[PDB]
Design a protein around this ligand. Structure first.
Ligand SMILES: [Ca+2]
Ligand SMILES: [Ca+2]
Ligand SMILES: [Ca+2]
Ligand SMILES: [Ca+2]
Lengths: 287, 219, 96, 96, 287, 218, 219
């Protein structure tokens, strides 16, 4: 699917003739399933049928369920996306710590390099030079924590020294919102690949279902940081709408200019293929 | 006799009496407007077992119970025919009536022979006697319950009406009166569909939630 | 009364093209404005000028020409939507 | 809601003519009737079907194609009048 | 919570006053939220509300969706306060090869023993004695392949020497149908346990995605072959009608006479708990 | 205006919009029966500010909103007579109408003289011109909310009707639509009385308990 | 749909499937003869809720299951229309079919332009494609149960038949097959009346004793 459908209004959803049926008192509209990529329910008054949920699982469409505050609550995870998952589990169990630390180190290098590119586009020579120094200083096992230092200097330079990631302000709320949406898309891509999402490529001690999808979604955070930096003065609603405009906007991949969903799908495919083939090629994404 | 609208997932069947409760005022008013405009609008579709869509002339819509006119030329004519059949089923009563009408015809014939002009006549029949008596239904002193009962009694007399529908008519009747209406509808075999905004307690009905979910309800 | 007028005719022959130009110039001289090709409209003051305009249009219609006439309110005229020849984000709800 | 639709586009190229035939066949398949060339109309049940029809028409519009959409009442749609066709010297004969 | 709520019938679900409202055509039932533990939807006609889904996210209860085939398709994944089953999957990833070989050998021994016992009930002493000899001769790593050797004896005894599993006939299609129903039930139980069904007890073949449930359902397989042997003359439709009555029929568990659903549930729970605790007790089922 | 029945202790006044709820189904159905039978039954009474009983002809009782035809013989008669009075108030306009009618009569008379068959005519009148034009109130109603508004307009136009009564007509309209109907009734000054089996939340209404006691609400 | 005969005390209603068992061979044969001769004889009277008597053309009588012809011009025509509606309900499939038909029409049009004569054509439609395909029901290899099931499926296609009646058709079917026939009849809503000399065990039916007493029977 190419289309992200967001329903913030109370209504009933049914599945008829390979068509999503939106039924409401005011109007009724039918949208084909093949065109639909992501389905987002932003309110608690929406009704749906389990048959439409089964058709969405067969169509491999990500379904997101939000709260009354409209923040995402829980998303649907299919058990079997493809038959290659059961064969990929043995490869994931057979993965090596050198390949995991190598691919994760290269991914963190791509994220820090993207932050230095964002500060370079923002015309900060000292900040992008320091972040570039941390990028050239990144090493295996991350003994110096140059990634966390790059994040602290990044947010502290962008939003001011008094700003922090632990604050409750709408800036950090929008950051966690964009990280939750991108984490949902990347997690759905990992579900398409079939590998276990709970197994991370960095720390084997940390146990989280979103760890792998976060490691894959690390290089794309600065894209959210840009719109968050531009709309920071706007209200949280307009910032959320501008965050929804990221799906409509297109970004330039190394090969050509593509949509965000295609870049995430192809990037995750190259990451899984590189993990199974033990680092044949590392996909690099630049702003 | 199944009725279907866009809000329903599957077409619902209406057999004997059926109580349809719409909890949403918007969907209820829109459905009633689609009931009055039914010929113009394609949203509400009522079809029989043949799947053929019934015309608005075949549909009978009733909202005001006391304002509807139960006395019509066809209803009174078919009613007089029914009374003539009831009198024809009994041979003795028909024989006596024939005797009396024959005596009256003899008297009037003698009075005609006494006149100077030449007069001819034919007969005085039973249908002409009923039409001269002016037999008709009385809605003047009738209560709303007796009015709806008389409407259910004359619905069999109406030939062209395929289905009878009442709009918010269950608010006047008590629970026991509703039980009598349904129990009589099961005997009359007619298809009646009631539309109420609020659910009635104690009777089987189809409930449409504000979520647009249709569920059967025993109470 | 808002008068919407569609105009058409086979344009192949040179005489037909000349007749089309003459009829279009006549429509412009009568106060009609061309929104797009074959699409025109004019604001008639009352039913009298509307009837007289109908008679005049019937008199000035070229050979094989065809004119469609429709009466429309101002609210319907402002609702006129002209599309001259695929959304990524579809929103069902408040449009924000 | 009575939908009056005008359709025009440059017909010169063969691809443009094929696109015109395809768009016309699409209009006929959707329930629209052609009163004359470029002139069509269709009776829409309500505003929702009208909006969906507008989106579909925008999606099916051919390249360089131009469509004019006007809303008219059903009684005003029946009021549609189709007319099908000052010189001092009138010549009946060869035009010289 | 404790009670596991499963919906096999058409119904609607709502949330009112910390009370789950389940509404079916026959009757309406209200269940407290704290009493419910795991929620499973068997059919595609069930209607639910996103508000109840959010309340379930706050209640941490696991939501399981199934297709028309009753095989579990997707489950609800919350972004925070994850369920304990996701923490239990790591132990399934830690399952030792010795415990898997012990449970697998016990399962094969139970299936072969049930086949020989069923042949004894059919009053064939030579074939049942041979299958019993193969049962007493079964060993770890399966060098003898006494299960595949007992197969041909069991089927050849039941349907005759001319019958085989490779041939295409209503008997083989009926066997695959019964194995599909039992695979759906056991797979639903494994999904209730939370363990990934892609990881199988058999170490040789990872091809099937149901391998865990397919290995767990083996001891109950001959119960299908009995009805298939009695009804073998009937058409495939009648064989499906006869196999559909197994859900209503009651069977004898070691402890007490029970329905098949409860027996498969207790067996699956004992299997999972035994695998996590490294072979405390092996559930044994005999016809 | 006030209405009085044996169940009430004192007659309650109905001014502008009024919502009356009857919590007893027997008293509600018997009350509607007393409304349709008001001419026959003397139990239910209505006393205006003059304290004078009114005939049933002055009472407008409307149950079905959509089933009530706005165009009637009496309504079209009063409307055509009203337009004829408006045209009669201006001598010059009526004179021009007489001139145009004289021209049309001269043309049609000439065409009749051109025919070979003898033709006799009388005249053309302004009333025949209005009836020929088909002047009537607008019959277009999208929803019951607009239809009830047209009923309020025609009711305010009719001088003979002193009261308009609706029976269970508030169940179709939403609470906001009920607020708009009450505000439009207060702006139109007309007297409207509603009869509902159950109470409506959010609006001021008179609740009649099963004990027969009447109490104000909101 | 009520049927009445002189032997019955009150007219019996036939709704969905109805199994009528006549224990007397004389009354059964006389009733079947009154079913074949129904237009001629006034003894057996079948009327709807309107009390109007249905014509023999509206009555559908069936005795031989395999000898009846299920394929008719009206049945095949309405069936082709139903298939055209099924193909019209899916926009994508209709679009693909339109594309293929467009290609074939292009080829045939080129072949027509290659000819020396001036040739004109119109279109190749979906109904013409179905008529060219020759879609029809196959009763040749069908079992009696599948034949009666196909008859219950095509009874909705028959417009003029008001009620379907089977004569001694329940002797061939097993109890489970009869349960499938009744359960399918409840979904199809059609009115089917079976006449059997002997009672069937396990199904609800109306029994007529040799005493001429009609009683409902659960088994
Ligand atoms: Ca006479
Ligand atoms: Ca008299
Ligand atoms: Ca043709
Ligand atoms: Ca052929």
């Amino acid at each position: 699917g190419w289309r992200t459908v967001v329903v913030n209004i109370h209504s009933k959803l049914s599945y008829k003739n390979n068509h999503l049926i939106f039924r409401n008192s005011y109007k009724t509209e039918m949208i084909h399933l093949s065109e639909i990529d992501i389905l987002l329910l932003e309110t608690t008054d929406i009704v749906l049928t389990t048959m439409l949920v089964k058709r969405l699982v067969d169509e491999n469409i990500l379904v997101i369920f939000c709260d009354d505050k409209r923040l995402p609550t829980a998303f649907l995870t299919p058990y079997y996306a493809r038959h290659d998952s059961s064969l990929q589990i043995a490869r994931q169990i057979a993965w090596k710590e050198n390949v995991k630390c190598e691919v994760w180190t290269a991914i963190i290098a791509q994220k820090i390099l993207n932050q230095s590119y964002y500060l370079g586009e923002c015309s900060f020579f000292e900040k992008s030079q320091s972040i570039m120094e941390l990028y050239h200083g990144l090493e295996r096992f991350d003994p110096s924590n140059r990634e966390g230092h790059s994040a602290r200097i990044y947010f502290n330079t962008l939003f001011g020294n008094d700003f922090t990631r632990e604050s409750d302000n709408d800036i950090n709320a929008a950051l966690d919102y964009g990280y939750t949406l991108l984490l949902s898309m990347f997690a759905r891509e990992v579900v398409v690949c079939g590998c276990m999402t709970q197994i991370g490529l960095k720390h084997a001690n940390q146990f989280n279902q979103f760890n792998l999808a976060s490691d894959i979604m690390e290089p794309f955070r600065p894209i959210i940081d840009r719109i968050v930096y531009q709309n920071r003065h706007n209200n949280f609603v307009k910032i959320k709408k501008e965050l929804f405009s990221i799906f409509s906007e297109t970004y330039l991949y190394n090969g050509k200019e593509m949509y965000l969903s295609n870049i995430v799908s192809d990037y995750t495919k190259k990451v899984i293929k590189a993990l199974n083939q033990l680092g044949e090629e590392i996909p690099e994404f630049r702003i | 006799m199944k009725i279907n609208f866009s809000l329903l997932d599957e077409p619902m069947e209406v057999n004997l009496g059926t109580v349809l409760v719409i909890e949403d005022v918007s969907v209820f008013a829109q459905l009633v407007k689609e009931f009055y405009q039914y010929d113009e609008q394609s949203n509400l579709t009522i079809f029989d077992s043949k799947i053929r869509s019934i015309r608005s002339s075949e549909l009978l819509l009733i909202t005001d119970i006391l304002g509807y006119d139960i006395n019509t030329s066809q209803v009174l004519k078919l009613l007089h025919t029914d009374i003539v059949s009831q009198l024809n089923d009994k041979p003795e009563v028909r024989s006596e009536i024939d005797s009396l009408v024959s005596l009256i015809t003899d008297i009037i014939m003698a009075e005609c022979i006494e006149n100077e002009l030449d007069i001819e006549y034919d007969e005085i029949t039973l249908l002409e006697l009923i039409k001269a008596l002016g037999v008709r239904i009385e809605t003047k002193s009738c209560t709303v319950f007796e009015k709806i009962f008389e409407i259910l009694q004359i619905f069999k007399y109406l030939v062209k009406k395929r289905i009878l529908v009442f709009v918010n008519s269950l608010s006047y009747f008590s629970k026991d009166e509703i039980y009598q209406i349904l129990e009589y509808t099961k005997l009359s075999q007619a298809d009646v569909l009631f539309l109420e905004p609020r659910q009635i307690e104690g009777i089987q009905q189809f409930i449409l939630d504000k979520d647009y979910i249709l569920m059967p309800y025993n109470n | 009364m808002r008068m919407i007028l569609m105009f058409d005719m086979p344009t192949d022959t040179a005489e037909e093209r000349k007749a089309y130009r003459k009829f279009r110039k006549f429509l412009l001289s009568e106060g009609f404005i061309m929104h797009q090709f074959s699409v025109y409209s004019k604001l008639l003051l009352n039913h009298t000028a509307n009837t007289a305009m109908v008679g005049r249009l019937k008199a000035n219609n070229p050979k094989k020409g065809n004119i469609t006439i429709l009466t429309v309110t101002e609210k319907q005229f402002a609702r006129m939507i002209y599309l001259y020849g695929e959304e990524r984000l579809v929103f069902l709800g408040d449009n924000y």
